[PDB]
Design a protein around this nucleic acid. Structure first.
Lengths: 69, 57, 35, 182, 59, 215, 50, 25, 78, 80, 68, 57, 73
RNA sequence: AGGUAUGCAGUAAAA
RNA sequence: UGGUUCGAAAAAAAAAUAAAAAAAAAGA
RNA sequence: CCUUUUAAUUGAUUAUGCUGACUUUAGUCCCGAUAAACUACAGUUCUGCUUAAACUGAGGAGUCAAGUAGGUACAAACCGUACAAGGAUUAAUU
RNA sequence: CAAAACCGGUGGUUUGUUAGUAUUUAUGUCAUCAACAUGUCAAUGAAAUAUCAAUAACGAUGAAACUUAUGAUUAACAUAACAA
RNA sequence: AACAGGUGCCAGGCCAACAAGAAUCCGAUCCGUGUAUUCCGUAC
RNA sequence: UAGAUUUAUAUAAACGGCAAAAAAAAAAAAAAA
RNA sequence: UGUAACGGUACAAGCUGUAAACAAAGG
């Protein structure tokens, strides 16, 4: 190389502003692909069916659709 | 690394003496080696990556 | 993605494309809660 | 024995501690004994003289053998009228009481004494057969510096009218600016 | 009444502070505290206090 | 994450616990584990109202347990995890002292970990050189005048309990003998101030000759 | 993933299909008659009132 | 990560190919 | 330069024996002889192992009691 | 990855970010930034803890073990 | 690092004849700790050197045994 | 059902209804928007109409 | 921690006890109430017509179990 | 030749 | 001592954050 | 068993085949720059390089990284560690 | 020429014994993106509510054990024992 | 023979709250839901 | 259906010009989706 | 709806929301 060697930089500002959560949202990519640390639309099954021996008074299924005061 | 064999020999002698064998007339009649495996580590070089092994016997 | 292109791109949830696929843990034909 | 899937729980049991039974299958086949404990989550039964292979040494230096848990389906109730093992039917009377009828004789097999059955300390799903020594103490018969005494605990101080008035006043006189912190 | 439950809430809060201090001290040595169930007892008492008050408000 | 504190509480849920530190803490100081979202004013009011403590100061730090990799045991899963919880460490300075056996850790297994003994003569981290700002007495405003020991009022208050002459506090095993002022000697030995006593004779000011070739 | 480079990838994979074949209805008729004859010959036929 | 197979699509395509193949003229 | 073929098991065994004799006669015999000559002096006592080692001793045991003609232990005193 | 939440790093915090990153933890606001880098505090916004007079209170954290027997008998006498 | 994400294990795949011991720096640190303990009347070095079950009060040892 | 919404008795806009229980155990349905109790559902006797499509089938 | 004041066994301590307690409690909820009503009507009919049914049939009609889970059997 | 300690608007001049 | 905050100057947005919770009758 | 059928995509010494295991080369190459002593009657080994002051009215003239790189028993563990008022006015107590 | 249902509740069948299974991160990349790591939640055993006694020997339990039970399983390949 | 589950492995009749066999004989070493013979239940 | 139920997921669209910041004085100002 | 961050819980691929596994015996 010439003089002092320069390679790919580790820059938190650049990485977070170019490849972060919101930047990935603004990108044009396949959003049906699962991303561990970012936005994706591989949807889950939700809370599973109650087993016959559990207490229905404690079994829970909904959070937002029933949110009262 | 011969401390392993020395530990085995010392323990065997102590065990035989405790069981009542005469240490004075106990001989090593034969041995048998049984491989168990080898742990591999990367070794990064100019044009290739090698794997160096540590034995387990 | 760099600032000039970010300033002209729009967020994914500003359209309806998110609801036009059936991708889910079980496959590609998601049956939504409540059918 | 391992805990069984709740799919195999038995809703109402035909065998209780103190019952006389005979083992039908296994190494201990044909052996009669008395049920010493039942576990309703394990579907397990303990029978005197059966599967006694766990040894415990006690104070006098002697070894005692404790009987092991076996599956409830390997024992059959004994009808005392005919002194033979028999299948059991459960019948509910108009009073609401459940009784056992022998399938070989048609007679009622009464439940063993209820006062001879003790329940697990933290899980009443396991029952044990009391011994005479433990039964005798039944007839023969501490606080801490942070426990409230019963005379204060059972005190009733709630009045509906007072509570309504006080809560309404709290809500209606609540302020929102701290004028005494500094 | 409301006053008694209000006082008991703070009493339980102080007890919980002490118990959590003991629990953290034990965790620093990688062992379990003494009489761990007191924390569950205090938690149950406080939750039941809140239940009692909220039912009266729901009325 | 934690629920925001309402203007009126009536039922505080925040747990203040004593934290046993491996570092040193002063006489009137104590370290507490506290929820991260509380302010110094909230902490002080909480302690003064629920316990009646007379708090003088609150200092706060945010403690996040370090990342840990599970690498050691047989069949190890090389997954990342944190031991404990993120919390606010509140160091409270009060009007009265707090026992060292309460506030700090001790050990007879690792004999070096005795902060109550070692005090501030050690740093309990990777820090090599300790940084301490100047003390209040060393400051100028509200600091100790270096000639006040000669004044009438301090001597009237001293009575027979105190002797104000600084010559009496000289450590014999550290100070050197007085030198002759007319002969070469160091300033740092016995002066301990940033000026030149008039009793030291006139000193020569030497200015560098930067261009000898010109002359 | 290609044949000879991954387990579960096939060059000529089995495909779902219909296994039904075709036969002459005349052959089916003749076979029914032969089956009745065979049952009579082997004594595997009984006639009942109802 | 696992390579999960899209059986709906694969079987639909297989049926389409089978029907076309067996209806060719 | 690289080998033109794989060395066989027969030759590898031959090499094992040859290297055994080389190492034996070059290192192991000498080390054993020195070890057995060192027995005529009290065993070495490392001052850096004082904290855990036994007190210094000079006696070297006779390890075959069946060939000892003398006394093995002294009677208890009174 | 070498930057971001991967490898157990989790969400970004001011401790792990360069100077200039602004992220708190959920504390309430108690004043206003000025136009010259100051912050005017208003103590009216300090939450008010409501603490009753705990002095001379007979209640305690737990209940004595005999209370169960006493209450059970007192309720059985009514039920029977 | 402690999380073993770096590449520092790459060099450890090759032999080295030895490693610096940093004894000057480590001894300065150790003596700082010793002074901190000693100003309060503790002989940390003596404690560290004591044999298992050995009790020595004050600045005593084999020489004390010899002359007493 | 998702294409439909309950109506608040006071504001007459889409609302959410929660079941609350009094001390005696009486149940009251309360609407979020106004806090009003829901009126009792119209009776089956009043609602009844013949299902002519089933007769046609 | 076991609580002796709690009448219903804790599920994580005694799941069988919790389930049986809920089964033996009086029916609550529209579905359970309806099922109990149908069982009661059948019981009344069978008691009236006892002579036309088996003892096993009568006993089964007498069996009581409320608050069953959907698709319990 | 960024902004310094009652703080928001607001015009001019300038080591 | 810095960040924050005003300016430069920015939706050119650092997911789980804020002077940032329905916004003055605030009960002094 | 035999019989009939099977759409099995049904026979592997070989595609510098694929995924792996295990041999030969071979016990061969590979070992970075300067080191000693810690004592049977006191002490100060030698060498390479030189910002090593840490209140003197002044936060001790920076940024950045270590997603906590000089804490802690001859530990690649557990535990602990960044306080802007620096809390010990601790010239105290004894 | 013979013969002539709708809305709740409860179970069962088929899909499907003949088919397959998919939810958590370790590891790569600036990024788009790529990609079946580590057997199983599980010592062994049907049962540990059969692992007791014990420096050692003989004992105990078990169908099988201080061990072909206190993880199983080819070939290549590793080591030994015996044989003329 | 799909007369489902469980019970030490292949059980219509051992358990599974509503039918019917602890059926008999033979099993290297424990057990048998196994072989052979036979009885019974079934609008399951 | 006894209560409780933090934070993020940039939402006045249970709504109507398009168009940055879920909707921005007229005009400049431009379009196959 | 779905998912996740922190927090609590055996410091967890489970459960769960500062009431963090349980109220069912109230003018």
């Amino acid at each position: 190389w010439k003089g002092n060697w320069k390679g790919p930089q580790r820059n938190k500002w650049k990485w977070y502003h170019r490849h972060g959560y919101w930047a990935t949202r603004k990108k044009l990519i396949d959003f049906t692909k699962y991303r561990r640390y970012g936005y994706h639309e591989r949807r889950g099954l939700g809370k599973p069916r109650m087993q016959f021996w559990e207490d229905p008074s404690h079994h829970k299924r909904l959070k937002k659709s029933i949110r009262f005061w | 690394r011969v401390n392993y064999l020395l530990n085995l020999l010392n323990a065997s002698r102590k065990k035989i003496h405790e069981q009542g064998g005469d240490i004075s007339r106990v001989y090593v009649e034969s041995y048998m080696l049984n491989i168990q495996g080898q742990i591999k580590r990367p070794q990064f070089r100019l044009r290739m990556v090698n794997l160096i092994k540590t034995w387990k016997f | 993605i760099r600032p000039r292109k970010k300033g002209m791109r729009l967020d994914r949830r500003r359209s309806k494309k998110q609801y036009k696929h059936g991708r889910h843990v079980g496959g590609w034909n998601y049956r939504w809660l409540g059918s | 024995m391992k805990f069984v899937h709740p799919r195999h729980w038995i809703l109402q049991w035909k065998i209780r501690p103190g019952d006389k039974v005979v083992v039908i299958s296994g190494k201990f086949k044909t052996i009669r004994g008395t049920v010493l404990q039942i576990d309703k989550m394990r579907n397990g039964v303990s029978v005197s003289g059966v599967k006694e292979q766990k040894r415990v040494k006690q104070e006098d230096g002697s070894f005692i053998r404790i009987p092991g848990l076996i599956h409830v389906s390997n024992v059959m109730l004994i009808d005392q009228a005919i002194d033979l093992p028999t299948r059991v039917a459960l019948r509910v009377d108009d009073r609401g009481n459940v009784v056992r009828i022998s399938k070989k004789s048609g007679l009622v097999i009464p439940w063993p004494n209820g006062e001879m059955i003790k329940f697990g300390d933290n899980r009443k799903s396991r029952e044990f057969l009391k011994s005479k020594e433990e039964r005798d103490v039944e007839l023969r018969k501490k606080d801490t510096p942070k426990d409230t005494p019963a005379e204060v605990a059972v005190e009733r101080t709630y009045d509906y009218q007072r509570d309504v008035a006080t809560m309404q006043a709290l809500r209606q006189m609540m302020t929102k600016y701290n004028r005494d912190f500094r | 009444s409301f006053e008694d439950l209000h006082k008991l809430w703070y009493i339980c809060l102080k007890e919980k502070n002490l118990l959590m201090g003991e629990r953290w001290a034990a965790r620093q040595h990688k062992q379990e505290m003494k009489q761990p169930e007191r924390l569950q007892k205090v938690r149950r008492t406080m939750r039941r206090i809140l239940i009692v008050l909220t039912k009266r408000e729901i009325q | 994450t934690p629920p925001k504190t309402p203007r009126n509480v009536f039922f505080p849920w925040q747990v203040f616990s004593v934290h046993r530190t491996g570092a040193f803490l002063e006489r009137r100081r104590v370290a507490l584990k506290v929820p991260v979202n509380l302010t110094k004013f909230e902490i002080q009011s909480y302690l003064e109202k629920i316990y009646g403590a007379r708090v003088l100061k609150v200092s706060t730090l945010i403690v996040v347990p370090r990342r840990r990799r599970d690498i050691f045991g047989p069949r190890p899963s090389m997954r990342y995890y944190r031991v404990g919880c993120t919390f606010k460490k509140a160091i409270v300075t009060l009007e009265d002292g707090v026992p060292d056996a309460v506030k700090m850790l001790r050990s007879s297994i690792e004999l070096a970990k005795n902060p109550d003994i070692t005090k501030h003569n050690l740093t309990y981290s990777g820090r090599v050189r300790a940084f301490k700002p100047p003390s209040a007495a060393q400051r100028w405003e509200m600091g100790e005048s270096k000639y006040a020991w000669r004044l009438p009022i301090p001597n009237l208050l001293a009575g027979d309990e105190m002797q104000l002459n600084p010559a009496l506090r000289i450590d014999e095993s550290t100070t050197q003998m007085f030198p002759d002022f007319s002969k070469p000697f160091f300033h740092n030995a016995h002066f301990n101030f940033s000026w030149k006593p008039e009793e030291v004779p006139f000193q020569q000011t030497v200015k560098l000759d930067i261009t000898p070739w010109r002359r | 993933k290609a044949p000879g480079k991954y387990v579960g990838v096939k060059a000529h994979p089995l495909r779902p299909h219909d296994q039904r074949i075709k036969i002459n209805k005349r052959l089916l008729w003749q076979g029914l008659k032969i089956m009745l004859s065979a049952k009579f010959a082997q004594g595997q036929i009984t006639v009942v009132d109802h | 990560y696992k390579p999960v197979i899209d059986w709906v699509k694969n079987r639909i395509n297989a049926r389409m190919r089978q029907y076309r193949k067996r209806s060719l003229k | 330069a690289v080998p033109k073929g794989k060395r066989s098991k027969h030759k590898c065994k031959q090499r094992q024996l040859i290297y055994f004799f080389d190492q034996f006669d070059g290192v192991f015999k000498r080390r054993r002889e020195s070890f057995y000559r060192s027995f005529y002096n009290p065993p070495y006592f490392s001052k850096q192992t004082e904290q855990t080692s036994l007190p210094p001793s000079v006696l070297r045991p006779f390890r075959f009691p069946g060939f000892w003609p003398g006394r093995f232990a002294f009677k208890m005193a009174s | 990855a070498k930057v971001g939440p991967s490898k157990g790093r989790g969400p970004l915090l001011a401790k792990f970010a360069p100077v200039g990153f602004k992220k708190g933890f959920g504390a309430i606001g108690l004043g206003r930034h000025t136009k010259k880098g100051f912050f005017i505090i208003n103590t009216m916004l300090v939450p008010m803890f409501k603490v009753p007079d705990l002095s001379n209170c007979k209640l305690k954290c737990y209940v004595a073990p005999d209370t169960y027997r006493i209450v059970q008998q007192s309720f059985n006498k009514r039920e029977l | 690092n402690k999380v073993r994400t770096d590449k520092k294990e790459r060099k450890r795949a090759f032999p080295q004849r030895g490693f610096w011991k940093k004894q000057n720096f480590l001894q300065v640190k150790n003596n700082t700790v010793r002074l901190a303990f000693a100003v309060q009347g503790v002989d940390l070095l003596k404690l560290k050197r004591l044999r298992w079950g050995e009790v020595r009060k004050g600045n005593t040892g084999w020489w004390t045994d010899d002359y007493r | 059902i998702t294409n439909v919404a309950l109506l608040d008795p006071v504001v007459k806009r889409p609302t959410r209804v929660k079941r609350r229980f009094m001390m005696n155990g009486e149940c009251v349905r309360i609407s979020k928007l106004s806090g009003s109790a829901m009126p009792e559902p119209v009776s089956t006797s009043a609602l009844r109409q013949p299902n002519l499509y089933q007769e046609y089938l | 921690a076991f609580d002796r004041w709690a009448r219903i066994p804790h599920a994580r301590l005694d799941a069988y006890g919790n389930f049986l307690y809920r089964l033996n409690q009086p029916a609550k909820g529209a579905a359970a109430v309806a099922r109990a009503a149908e069982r009661e009507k059948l019981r009344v009919e069978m008691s009236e017509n006892a002579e036309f049914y088996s003892d096993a049939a009568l006993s089964a009609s007498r069996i009581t179990l409320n608050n069953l889970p959907p698709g319990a059997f």
